[PDB]
Design a protein around this ligand. Structure first.
Ligand SMILES: OC[C@H]1O[C@H](O)[C@H](O)[C@@H](O)[C@@H]1O
Ligand SMILES: OC[C@H]1O[C@H](O)[C@H](O)[C@@H](O)[C@@H]1O
Ligand code: NA
Ligand code: NA
Lengths: 270, 270
């Protein structure tokens, strides 16, 4: 039982830190040493990481972020059993791949919001909304939801490449600046980090959350229940997906014998 | 420019995630691939990590946590220039070692608290307070502070091996249960994660923060300003220490030519 690598976009995303920790504690119990690398969505960083498996510095890898599916596929095909993909919204031929139903969860969270009476929506993504991006199952869910309710998408309430709390503060400060009649009723943040920042800037401006603007998180990160306005959010089953990924890897490695729900978490912010 | 390892106790500690990120972005700019491993304070995990340098799978290492100084020293002496230690409250012969003045910062934060009128103190540590532990410069500062003001240490208000928000919730629930006359006036948490959990349980019990119990954080983690009661805390200079550590490593590697304050951050919780 040797070295395993985990690949994520950003370790300071508490979702990824928590996924890594759950994977690492189980793999460690099985005798492996686990290391994490972050890409910041750079395909070159993904390539470089995969060279560690190609050169057999690692026995196996778990990818929780994917930039170049075709590159990952070629590695997986060359290293059968040694590449596992988890929660990257992609199935990679040659790699056991776990996909969670983010389109469904996003539609369900948006329906929740519509059912509370919200009609003017702001939508935030970590990707560039106009092109292919991380989180596009969610962007499609958003567009399908708006179409299903014949709601006009306001382009001025779409925010792309927003990842951190500090970026969310800037979004929230802009939304708080808006006249009541053009301000959104609700913000779909795609991230609890972003949500905390959005909410902080709204409250700084005496904008009421949720009464003036409801804020929907994503992930149910550790701080979510502890936030100033405890976050309503989409809960990802971090421990369960970690256990699943870990088992798939250990099975592929020949270590283990053969033998995941998103949920809406309602608190105060929406 | 090759592979660098970073060693920390726990990646889900936002202090460590943030330190890693700052190191990694600078090293990445210099052409290195950086990986992080966590120990959960297990000396065997530290040993295993150091084998990666001994076997030259890594070019260099940065340790932000140390379990067995003498073991780290032997490696550093065998691999001159390749082992850097940062913020581990230890100087390791053979490794450039950066120490921050946590005893001073702790005395200063406690003096702050005494000056606000607090007299009955609870003290929380991530270590086992009775023996040698991570954070003992801080424990000594606490005991010296109490002695300097002739304050009796209440053993029942000392909490060891407390690391996470969930553990802090349990501490806070116990403190909130206390009759006003035996309840502390102030809690020194040693961690912003712990502080958020303590405060949440106090507020759940209608204990006022800071009026009934003041809560002092440690680190100034990303969520600190965003907490329900924004944290008064000891700010660690994450970006500066990362840059320093990175430079010391790159100098030792022959890549770079030759060429840190803690501060009290006052917000609302104390
Ligand atoms: O934390 C926000 C998001 O970050 C990453 O994109 C993860 O892959 C996604 O699952 C998570 O929702
Ligand atoms: O996050 C709480 C503490 O965790 C670790 O012990 C770090 O070494 C220390 O610097 C930090 O204050
Ligand atoms: Na409203
Ligand atoms: Na008081």
């Amino acid at each position: 039982t040797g070295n395993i690598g985990v690949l994520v976009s950003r370790v300071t995303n508490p979702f990824f830190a928590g996924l890594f920790d759950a994977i690492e504690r189980e793999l460690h119990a099985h005798g492996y040493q686990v290391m994490i690398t972050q890409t910041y969505d750079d395909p070159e960083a993904e390539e470089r990481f995969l060279k560690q498996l190609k050169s057999r510095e690692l026995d196996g890898v778990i990818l929780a972020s994917v930039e170049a599916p075709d590159r990952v596929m070629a590695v997986a095909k060359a290293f059968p059993g040694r590449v596992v993909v988890v929660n990257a919204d992609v199935q990679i031929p040659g790699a056991t791949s776990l996909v969670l139903p983010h389109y469904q969860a996003t539609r369900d969270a948006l329906d929740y919001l519509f059912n509370q009476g919200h009609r003017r929506f702001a939508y935030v993504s970590g990707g560039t909304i106009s092109g292919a991006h991380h989180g596009q199952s969610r962007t499609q869910a958003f567009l399908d939801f708006m179409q299903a309710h014949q709601l006009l998408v306001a382009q001025d309430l779409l925010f792309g490449q927003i990842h951190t709390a500090k970026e969310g503060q800037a979004v929230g400060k802009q939304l708080a600046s808006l006249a009541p009649n053009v301000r959104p009723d609700a913000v779909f943040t795609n991230s609890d980090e972003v949500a905390v920042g959005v909410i902080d800037s709204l409250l700084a401006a005496d904008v009421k959350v949720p009464d003036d603007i409801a804020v929907m998180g994503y992930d149910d990160q550790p701080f979510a229940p502890f936030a100033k306005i405890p976050l309503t959010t989409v809960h990802q089953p971090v421990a369960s997906m970690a256990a699943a990924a870990t088992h798939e890897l250990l099975k592929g490695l020949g270590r283990q014998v053969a033998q995941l729900h998103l949920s809406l978490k309602i608190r105060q912010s929406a």
